[PDB]
Design a binder for these strands. Structure first.
Ligand SMILES: [Zn+2]
Lengths: 155, 84, 141, 291, 49, 368, 84, 330, 144, 54, 122
RNA sequence: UGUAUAUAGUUAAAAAUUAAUAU
């Protein structure tokens, strides 16, 4: 639960004001996963008490629920090749981008359209094959990349 | 990779050490540089926590059977003087 | 117990704003921004319109894999002159994503060459609606 | 002539990273940032142990255990010969990791060697840690002059300086060759006398416990009221009579002759006599106490 | 409880002069000697009749 | 503060059998290995071997002073035993130069060769001159050098103030502050300090009056929570909580409280230096200070940074008394092109990406 | 008391005068301290008062016994008190 | 009801860093001096109470006086007056007599005629009680050296062989010292030292040329009483009737004290003069390993109230206490 | 540090420097604008004298300007004076420009039309050669 | 090291178990079984004071 | 005013008057040693001097190197600062930028001779 | 890697983003 303390010195601001800007994405923020899985991620609720890039996905392994929107459409036998997320499972998701101005130490501050993620297993092995979105430079850390093999290119 | 401390002691007194210069197989110029190829050890057992005080030790041949050679109530040795 | 919390000595309370005309502040910031267009970090701009839209090809030499090249459609023009601010705010629509990101324009790794003649008050509105429709339908609902 | 710091390339190779002295989030250790009130010197940590203050600093008296501030005017058999009464410094935790004084410096010159004629080129014997304490090259002079070489005795080098100091139970043949014990039974005495102290030394030597060769000890009844003599002869033939001071007894003589045995075997090793391997190690050196 | 007693307690006695009389100048509770042994200085001037 | 406590050496055991080198007893006249034998022989205690030639000491000491000459290459660092550092010369652990008064002038964003953006506040050093040298009763460690600033009409100062500068001989300076120096870092009254007195890679300590904010309440002065927005809270949106505990009756000194919120003397300890326009007397720091433009801010040096001296051998040695530019050199000729100094790269790696250790090359990307 | 002696040995003495001047004169603040500022504490003999000629103090300690440490804040609540 | 913004137990008031340093008492306690010595813990009232509480006595200067080194001495011409009185005593042993002669030296070098008969009367009588030994021979030879009567030193030395007594290891130094201070060149002391090395009575571990120097450079450090170069050439003595510090030590620890109660000095001189079945004797090993640190360390009953009170050993002293001079420095 | 030490928004004080810092917010720190409803104690704002509402304050800015033009003196009280003299240097900055944009930008502001008929005639003749500080703020002595 | 509640309970279990005056407190210290058989008499801490531990 | 604050607000101008005394006497001793003999004991050698301490490099009880720093500022050298002009700074100092990033120490034996004085650690 | 069925230990980078002097 990374907090700050509004005291004209400690203050999140809004982004758009330098590195270590603000708003670490409290507990449940309904991410929009982008792996090539059952997750249809009109919702995938967040469950860890923080999220950000300056807050560094590198360290925390932010547990995330899946407030599923749970498919576009699937079918077959009762039990199949497990990539099809159950409507209530929990996964250490990997946040890709944000809808918030994420300043970096290069002054480049990116604001994306939808704040997305990729479901990952308990062991940080991505539960998805491909990725249908970009991903800020906060990936490429050996934390997840060694399993997040560069499913695609970055921004 | 024993005891990660790694240069944790780096210290031996001028006393209680022995001497200064070793070398492995080579010589510098001095035409006599056959020194040791020496070893790098632990200082005298636990340094002074055990024995904080030491009594004055004379040279060995001056130590054993220290003769009693006095002048007027003082002991004159070839090296030491003391009021007996 | 107690504490001062306000130091009003003559050294702290006095202000040099009076004597400040001795310094040509901006004529330093000119030359300050002049020593950054010389190193190649930045290339001059004199544009108020004719830059509200264009076509930058960003080359953020991010050491991540390799330089990222994003065709973009500038929509800020933050400063209107060669000074330190810069600020293009290119839209840049990477492949499927929409990423309103603004380049500080002084950065040696974050280089970009815009081309005029498309600075159309139409083509600008072409993308604004494209990012207005992308903004709205991205809240995950 | 190396470089005392790693280089960036050297540091980068191993996979490590350069330590920031910079805007890093880390502590950037700088205690004395607000506590040390006054001029603070660029010696990193010279006021921490005191308590990270600079407060009092003017008093010269400090609670001094033996060998500290004002103890210098008392006789403590150790600090009498181990600290010049001048340099005695402040209390324990009030150590002087940095003492700044005002005045003109006077650097007194170093002392020179005594009883050494100038320019006399000495032969150099090099010692070091490597030598296990058994090594004869360990307990003797390092710089061997022609001045400290006894010539009235045959010596190739000045004799040893330091001698091992341990208690000897048994009279093992360290380097002696014949231990004769002369008494005159015409002299008599009941109770602990020198007659008794020397004759048990015969028994204590001839004991089935001491590894002394029983056939190499010679008793000798005298006649002319010869006080009990104990004569040991080393390989070089120089005889040695441990002085039988009154009140002596077995464990002293077995201690005298064995302790001197290391000195005398040293003198034999100085004249040039080759020495043998000794079985017993009265000085525990290859031993550790186990449980 | 009560107030602490902040009066002025009298001070303890000085040491008497050394003996050098052999008259048992040391004895304290004897009939001859008044307690006080004050042979101070120009006391011989205080010659009493 | 662990890792800050230096090697602990008890005074009771800094004696002969400890000294890393041969311990030297002084006799008042000359050093000698042995204790002084008191001349009144009665003064000797019984059974105290008054040593006059100890074959164990003298030979251990014979092996020191001889071997230092025989094999000099090895024992070079042991020459600070008898060859002490002279006074002056910028002793590494001792000397402390003064600082120079400054003025916040503007702010700019500046980047390295790498794309690290630094919000750079550029301080103008208008006219810095030594106005008076002080002391405290001529004691040690209590020597202070005072530095003027900002040449100013004699009218703008009160007559009692300006009558001081007029006495010292310096042109009347707008403001002056006192820096503690070690006596070997003095200069003559009337030295005109120049900005190059700092080195582009240094770390300076700045002190100023952080911008006044009035009389701000407690949710601004400090960080206080408090008050649900629409969930009750009759009149409690920002008021503090319980002052005392309950029964102390004595509101504990420092609770913090509402207050005057920041017109005080603030300090940044170890901000490094970025550039130096020694033609403009500008010095750029990669930070943002919270002071109104024109806030006179004094610049000492940062003394020791992470247990290591700032001005050591491997990391730059300063212009010791102060940088005095050469006689052939003047600034009226050159231009801002030539008057610009820059720093080493403060950050090891481009900071938007991670260190080369965490970023992974394609070799492991092709994990297989 | 020793950790107070590191800081200033004269303070160890001043703490005790205060305890004998505040043995009767605690009542009003003017006579609590005005005596204290009449004594001059010197951790060594050298002192600027040869110009005042301090006459020595002919006084030998009276109590050969040692000093008990009695807590300030020790309350006696009943005395030997003939009326028991 | 959790997650405080202000973690930690940084106390409120105790911040001065001089009277409460932020150092864990686990790591700070190791400086509390539990053997604290300089701010001494023995007032001056006791220094005399603990004197008599040993059985010690205060003698007038002429008999003796604790000298500058707090070592009790006997004044010559008060030493002889003992030997005049107690020579017949049954408890006046061998080494008592020679000790008289040694005390008669700082006068036999100052009064070489009036005190050279006392030496001989100690000599002549010593032989009548104890047959003939080296103590009396080394002593009187040393006395004859200081009298600057070198011929007497030679006239004594040649009687060692005449009595079979092999000249002791000192009997050369008593002679080496004589041939030096009597104004005779070297090769009259050298030829004596070279005698000693051959007979092994003296031992020299160095080339024989330099040991003899180290010998004389101690025998001129000890210059004669009437000269003005050396330690014996000093006449200043600390006149003190009692040592200024009755608890001084001569070892390492308070229980290694210097001044010992008569009633324990006796039970010491006993064990050093009996069989030694626990500690070996005449050897540099000393089985009884000194460990005056691992011994008791705590203030007893007699560290607070001070020493007991045993009445001063003092004389009714009928002899008249007359003060009728000032005597000093022999 | 990298972000401003005091983040996006905080009110410094009356009598405080600009202390420019990288920020998203917009501050004028300059008030060359004529006939402007920017009342405040900042730099780019003329002094906000007290009134019931920024509207009613603007209504006081009307009848105190149209009465300075009508008769060239108005004995105004308190923080209205430093707030009026800047409105007398604006009316002349409005009366000098002359274009029919300005003559309305004052017509919107004056309660009466004859004034905007006066201000544009006398002031170009009057202040043809004065270029700033058209209003003299001399303080009367007896406080109300 | 189990404080043997009175001094008198102290017993030397091992050959190497001896007594020691660890700062006025009679204790038992053994090289072997170093803390296994160690006993320490009950008494005030080595550095107490008159207001803290009476 | 507290107790400890009192003792100093009383003894602060009583210690200054004490040390200013000794110095004022230190000038007196500095006089009668001009015509007098070379030097007595007299608290050292009795000019206004500071003897040098060759005894500053210790190996503590824990076997770790402890160096004593002693600096003796010369009253004649410091005044020789406050009058003369300092020399023009060497261009190899300021025209060079001070390195930011002090790198860690690397151990090393000096030359082909393994002297190195740490005793070890392996 | 030491150790043994798995494997330690000074540190460094990053992260939790902020600096504080009454006469
Ligand atoms: Zn046991």
């Amino acid at each position: 639960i990374i907090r700050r303390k509004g005291s004209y010195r400690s203050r999140w601001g809004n982004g758009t004001e330098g590195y270590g800007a603000g708003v670490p994405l409290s507990d449940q923020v309904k991410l929009h996963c982008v792996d090539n899985t059952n997750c249809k991620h009109v919702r995938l609720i967040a469950k860890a008490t923080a999220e950000r890039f300056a807050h560094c996905r590198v360290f925390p392994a932010v547990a995330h629920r899946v407030s599923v929107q749970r498919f576009k459409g699937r079918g077959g036998g009762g039990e199949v090749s497990r990539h099809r997320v159950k409507p209530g499972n929990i996964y250490w998701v990997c946040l890709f981008t944000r809808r918030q101005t994420n300043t970096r130490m290069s002054g480049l501050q990116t604001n994306f359209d939808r704040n997305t993620c990729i479901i990952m297993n308990d062991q940080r092995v991505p539960l998805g094959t491909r990725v249908m979105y970009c991903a800020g430079r906060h990936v490429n850390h050996k934390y997840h990349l060694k399993a997040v093999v560069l499913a695609n290119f970055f921004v | 990779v024993r005891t990660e401390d790694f240069f944790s002691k780096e210290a031996v007194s001028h006393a209680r050490r022995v001497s200064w210069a070793p070398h492995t197989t080579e010589k510098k110029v001095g035409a006599f540089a056959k020194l040791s190829r020496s070893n790098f050890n632990d200082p005298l057992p636990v340094s002074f926590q055990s024995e904080p005080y030491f009594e004055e030790e004379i040279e060995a041949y001056r130590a054993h059977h220290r003769p009693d050679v006095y002048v007027y109530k003082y002991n004159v040795s070839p090296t030491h003087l003391s009021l007996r | 117990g107690y504490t001062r919390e306000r130091t009003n000595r003559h050294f702290f309370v006095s202000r040099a704003n009076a004597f400040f005309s001795r310094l040509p502040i901006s004529r330093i910031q000119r030359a300050l921004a002049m020593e950054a267009i010389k190193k190649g970090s930045m290339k001059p701009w004199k544009h108020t319109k004719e830059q509200i839209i264009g076509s930058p090809i960003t080359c953020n030499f991010e050491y991540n894999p390799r330089p990222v090249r994003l065709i973009g459609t500038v929509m800020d023009a933050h400063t209107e002159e060669t000074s330190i601010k810069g600020g293009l705010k290119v839209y840049a629509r990477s492949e499927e994503a929409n990423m309103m990101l603004w380049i500080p324009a002084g950065n040696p790794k974050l280089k970009y060459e815009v081309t005029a003649a498309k600075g159309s008050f139409e083509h600008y509105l072409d993308e604004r609606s494209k990012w207005d429709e992308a903004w709205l339908t991205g809240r995950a609902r | 002539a190396p470089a005392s710091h790693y280089t960036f390339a050297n540091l980068k190779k191993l996979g490590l990273c350069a330590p920031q002295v910079a805007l890093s989030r880390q502590p950037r250790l700088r205690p004395h940032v607000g506590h040390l009130n006054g001029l603070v010197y660029p010696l990193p940590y010279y006021a921490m142990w005191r308590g990270n203050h600079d407060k009092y600093t003017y008093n010269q008296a400090t609670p001094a255990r033996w060998g500290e501030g004002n103890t210098n005017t008392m006789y403590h058999q150790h600090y009498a010969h181990a600290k010049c009464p001048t340099d005695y410094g402040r209390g324990g935790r009030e150590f002087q990791f940095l003492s700044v004084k005002r005045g003109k410096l006077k650097r007194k010159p170093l002392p020179t060697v005594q009883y050494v004629d100038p320019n006399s080129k000495p032969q150099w014997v090099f010692k070091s840690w490597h030598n296990p304490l058994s090594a004869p090259s360990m307990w003797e002079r390092e710089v061997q002059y022609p001045e400290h070489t006894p010539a009235h005795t045959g010596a190739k080098r000045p004799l040893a300086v330091v001698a091992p100091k341990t208690s000897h139970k048994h009279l093992f043949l360290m380097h002696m060759e014949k231990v004769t014990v002369t008494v005159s039974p015409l002299l008599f005495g009941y109770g602990h006398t020198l007659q008794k102290a020397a004759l048990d030394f015969y028994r204590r030597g001839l004991s089935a416990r001491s590894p002394f060769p029983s056939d190499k000890m010679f008793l000798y009844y005298s006649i002319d009221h010869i006080t009990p003599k104990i004569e040991v002869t080393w390989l070089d033939g120089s005889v040695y009579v441990p002085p039988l001071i009154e009140g002596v007894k077995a464990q002293d003589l077995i201690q005298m002759v064995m302790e001197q045995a290391w000195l005398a075997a040293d003198r034999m090793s100085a004249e040039g006599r080759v020495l043998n391997p000794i079985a017993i190690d009265d000085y525990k050196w290859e031993q550790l106490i186990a449980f | 409880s009560s107030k602490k007693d902040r009066t002025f307690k009298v001070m303890p006695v000085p040491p008497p002069p050394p003996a050098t009389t052999a008259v048992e100048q040391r004895d304290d509770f004897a009939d001859n000697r008044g307690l006080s042994a004050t042979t101070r200085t120009l006391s011989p001037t205080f010659r009493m009749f | 503060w662990y890792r800050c406590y230096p090697s602990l050496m008890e005074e009771k055991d800094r004696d002969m059998y400890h000294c890393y080198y041969p311990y030297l007893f002084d006799h008042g006249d000359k050093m000698s290995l042995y204790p002084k034998i008191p001349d009144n022989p009665r003064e000797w205690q019984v059974e105290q071997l008054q040593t006059t030639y100890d074959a164990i000491r003298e030979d251990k000491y014979d092996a020191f002073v001889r071997l230092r000459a025989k094999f000099p290459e090895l024992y070079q660092d042991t020459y600070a035993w008898d060859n002490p550092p002279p006074f002056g010369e910028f002793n590494m652990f001792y000397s402390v130069r003064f600082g120079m008064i400054g003025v916040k002038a503007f702010t700019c964003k500046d980047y390295d060769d790498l794309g690290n953006q630094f919000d750079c506040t550029a301080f103008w050093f208008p006219d810095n001159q030594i106005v008076k040298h002080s002391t405290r009763n001529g004691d040690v460690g209590t020597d202070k050098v005072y530095v003027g600033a900002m040449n100013v009409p004699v009218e703008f100062h009160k007559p009692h103030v300006a009558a001081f500068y007029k006495a010292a001989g310096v042109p009347v300076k707008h403001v002056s502050a006192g820096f503690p120096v070690t006596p070997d870092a003095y200069a003559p009254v009337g030295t005109k300090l120049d900005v190059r007195h700092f080195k582009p890679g240094q770390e300076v300590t700045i002190t100023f009056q952080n911008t006044d904010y009035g009389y701000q309440g407690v949710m601004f002065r400090h960080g206080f929570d408090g008050g649900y927005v629409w969930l009750g809270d009759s009149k409690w949106q920002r008021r503090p909580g319980c002052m005392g505990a309950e029964g102390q009756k004595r509101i504990y000194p420092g609770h913090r409280m509402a207050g005057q919120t920041g017109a005080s003397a603030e300090t940044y300890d170890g901000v490094p230096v970025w550039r130096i326009d020694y033609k403009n007397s500008l010095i750029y720091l990669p930070t943002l200070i919270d002071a109104d433009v024109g806030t006179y801010v004094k610049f000492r040096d940062t003394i020791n940074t992470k247990g290591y001296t700032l001005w050591n051998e491997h990391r730059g040695t300063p212009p010791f008394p102060t940088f005095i530019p050469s006689e052939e050199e003047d600034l009226s000729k050159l231009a801002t092109d030539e008057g610009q100094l820059t720093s080493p790269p403060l950050y090891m790696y481009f900071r938007d990406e991670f260190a080369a250790a965490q970023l992974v090359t394609q070799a492991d990307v092709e994990d297989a | 008391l020793s950790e107070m002696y590191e800081r200033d040995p004269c303070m160890v003495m001043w703490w005790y005068l205060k305890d004998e001047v505040n043995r009767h004169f605690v009542r009003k603040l003017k006579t609590r301290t005005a005596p204290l500022e009449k004594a001059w504490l010197y951790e060594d003999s050298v002192h600027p008062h040869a110009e005042k000629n301090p006459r020595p103090l002919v006084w030998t300690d009276t109590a050969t016994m040692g000093w008990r440490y009695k807590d300030p804040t020790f309350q006696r609540r009943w005395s030997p008190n003939q009326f028991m | 009801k959790g997650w405080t913004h202000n973690p930690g137990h940084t106390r409120r008031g105790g911040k001065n860093l001089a009277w409460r340093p932020k150092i864990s008492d686990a790591k700070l306690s190791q400086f509390v001096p539990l053997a604290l010595v300089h701010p001494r813990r023995h007032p001056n009232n006791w220094q005399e109470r603990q004197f008599n509480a040993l059985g010690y006595t205060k003698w007038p200067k002429d008999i003796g006086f604790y000298n500058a080194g707090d070592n009790f001495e006997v004044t010559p011409e008060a030493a002889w007056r003992l030997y005049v009185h107690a020579r017949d005593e049954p408890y006046w042993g061998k080494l008592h007599c020679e000790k008289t002669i040694i005390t008669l030296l700082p006068v036999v070098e100052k009064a070489p005629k009036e005190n050279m008969e006392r030496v001989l009367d100690v000599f002549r009588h010593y032989l009548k009680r104890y047959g003939a030994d080296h103590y009396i021979y080394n002593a009187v030879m040393q006395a004859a050296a200081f009298a600057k009567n070198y011929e007497q030193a030679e006239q004594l030395f040649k009687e060692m062989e005449t009595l079979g007594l092999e000249p002791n290891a000192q009997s050369y130094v008593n002679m080496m010292l004589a041939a030096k201070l009597c104004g005779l060149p070297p090769e009259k002391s050298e030829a004596y030292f070279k005698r000693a090395v051959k007979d092994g009575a003296m031992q020299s571990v160095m080339r024989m040329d330099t040991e003899f120097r180290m010998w004389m450079d101690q025998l001129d450090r000890l210059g004669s009483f009437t000269a003005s170069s050396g330690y014996l050439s000093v006449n200043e003595e600390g006149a003190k009737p009692m040592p200024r510090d009755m608890w001084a030590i001569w070892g390492w620890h308070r229980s290694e004290s210097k001044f010992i109660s008569r009633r324990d000095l006796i039970m010491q001189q006993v064990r050093a003069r009996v069989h030694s079945g626990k500690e070996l004797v005449g050897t540099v090993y000393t089985k009884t390993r000194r460990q005056p640190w691992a011994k008791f360390n705590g203030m007893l009953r007699h560290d607070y109230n001070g020493p007991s009170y045993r009445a001063p050993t003092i004389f009714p002293d009928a002899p008249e206490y007359t003060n009728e001079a000032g005597h000093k420095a022999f | 540090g990298r972000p401003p030490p005091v983040m996006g928004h905080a009110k410094r004080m009356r009598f405080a420097g600009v202390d420019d810092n990288p920020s998203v917010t917009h501050k004028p720190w300059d008030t060359s604008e004529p006939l402007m409803a920017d009342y405040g104690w900042e730099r780019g704002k003329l002094p906000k004298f007290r009134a019931r509402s920024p509207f009613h304050r603007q209504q006081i800015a009307r009848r105190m300007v149209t009465e300075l033009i009508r008769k060239d003196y108005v004995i105004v009280g308190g923080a209205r004076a430093p707030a009026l003299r800047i409105l007398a240097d604006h009316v002349v900055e409005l009366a000098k420009a002359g274009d029919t944009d300005s003559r309305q930008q004052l017509a919107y502001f004056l309660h009466d039309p004859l004034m905007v008929d006066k201000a544009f005639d006398e002031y170009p003749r009057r202040f043809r050669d004065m270029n700033a500080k058209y209003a003299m703020m001399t303080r009367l002595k007896g406080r109300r | 090291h189990p404080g043997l509640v009175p001094r008198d309970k102290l017993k030397l279990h091992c050959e190497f178990c001896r007594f020691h005056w660890v700062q006025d407190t009679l204790v038992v210290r053994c090289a072997a079984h170093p803390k296994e058989h160690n006993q320490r008499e009950i008494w005030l801490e080595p550095t107490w004071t008159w207001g803290k531990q009476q | 005013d507290s107790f400890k604050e009192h003792y100093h607000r009383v003894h602060l101008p009583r210690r200054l008057a004490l040390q200013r005394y000794i110095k004022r006497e230190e000038a007196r001793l500095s006089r009668h040693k001009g015509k007098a003999v070379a030097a007595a004991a007299a608290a050292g050698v009795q000019p206004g001097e500071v003897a040098y301490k060759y005894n500053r490099w210790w190996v503590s009880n824990d076997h770790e190197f402890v160096h004593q720093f002693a600096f003796v500022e010369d009253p004649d050298v410091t005044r020789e600062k406050r009058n003369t002009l300092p020399l023009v700074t060497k261009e190899n100092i300021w025209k060079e930028p001070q390195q930011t990033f002090f790198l860690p120490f690397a151990p090393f034996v000096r030359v082909v001779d393994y002297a190195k004085d740490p005793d070890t650690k392996f």
